[PDB]
Amino acid sequence: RSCIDTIPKSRCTAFQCKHSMAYRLSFCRKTCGTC
């Protein structure tokens, strides 16, 4: 189970991490903690 972020965490900030899953889905996989 290997996933990698491919976004600026900046985008998956606390404000979009639990708001913009569009990043926190599989863009900020680890970065947020969703993969």
PDB file of C-alpha atoms in Angstrom:
ATOM      1  CA  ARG A   1       0.000   0.000   0.000  1.00  0.00           C
ATOM      2  CA  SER A   2       2.259   2.782  -1.324  1.00  0.00           C
ATOM      3  CA  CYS A   3       0.762   6.217  -2.040  1.00  0.00           C
ATOM      4  CA  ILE A   4       2.547   9.504  -2.646  1.00  0.00           C
ATOM      5  CA  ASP A   5       1.440  13.141  -2.619  1.00  0.00           C
ATOM      6  CA  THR A   6       1.715  15.113  -5.810  1.00  0.00           C
ATOM      7  CA  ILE A   7       0.337  18.374  -4.510  1.00  0.00           C
ATOM      8  CA  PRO A   8       1.660  21.324  -2.491  1.00  0.00           C
ATOM      9  CA  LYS A   9       0.476  20.535   1.056  1.00  0.00           C
ATOM     10  CA  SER A  10      -0.179  24.222   0.945  1.00  0.00           C
ATOM     11  CA  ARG A  11      -3.318  23.321  -0.960  1.00  0.00           C
ATOM     12  CA  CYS A  12      -4.196  20.571   1.521  1.00  0.00           C
ATOM     13  CA  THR A  13      -3.941  23.007   4.356  1.00  0.00           C
ATOM     14  CA  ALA A  14      -6.232  22.575   7.386  1.00  0.00           C
ATOM     15  CA  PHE A  15      -8.593  24.739   5.386  1.00  0.00           C
ATOM     16  CA  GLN A  16      -8.762  22.365   2.356  1.00  0.00           C
ATOM     17  CA  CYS A  17      -7.582  19.137   3.942  1.00  0.00           C
ATOM     18  CA  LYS A  18     -10.929  18.442   5.663  1.00  0.00           C
ATOM     19  CA  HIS A  19     -12.703  20.754   3.216  1.00  0.00           C
ATOM     20  CA  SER A  20     -11.136  20.176  -0.174  1.00  0.00           C
ATOM     21  CA  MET A  21     -10.800  16.392  -0.458  1.00  0.00           C
ATOM     22  CA  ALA A  22     -10.049  17.320  -4.061  1.00  0.00           C
ATOM     23  CA  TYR A  23      -6.506  17.504  -2.706  1.00  0.00           C
ATOM     24  CA  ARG A  24      -6.897  15.468   0.510  1.00  0.00           C
ATOM     25  CA  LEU A  25      -8.300  12.586  -1.562  1.00  0.00           C
ATOM     26  CA  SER A  26      -5.329  11.201  -3.408  1.00  0.00           C
ATOM     27  CA  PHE A  27      -3.471  14.413  -4.233  1.00  0.00           C
ATOM     28  CA  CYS A  28      -2.132  14.956  -0.674  1.00  0.00           C
ATOM     29  CA  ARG A  29      -2.319  11.273   0.138  1.00  0.00           C
ATOM     30  CA  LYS A  30       0.163  11.214   2.975  1.00  0.00           C
ATOM     31  CA  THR A  31       0.487  14.988   3.210  1.00  0.00           C
ATOM     32  CA  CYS A  32      -2.921  15.013   4.912  1.00  0.00           C
ATOM     33  CA  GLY A  33      -3.303  11.385   5.845  1.00  0.00           C
ATOM     34  CA  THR A  34      -5.889   9.927   3.565  1.00  0.00           C
ATOM     35  CA  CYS A  35      -4.081   7.181   1.665  1.00  0.00           C
TER      36      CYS A  35
END
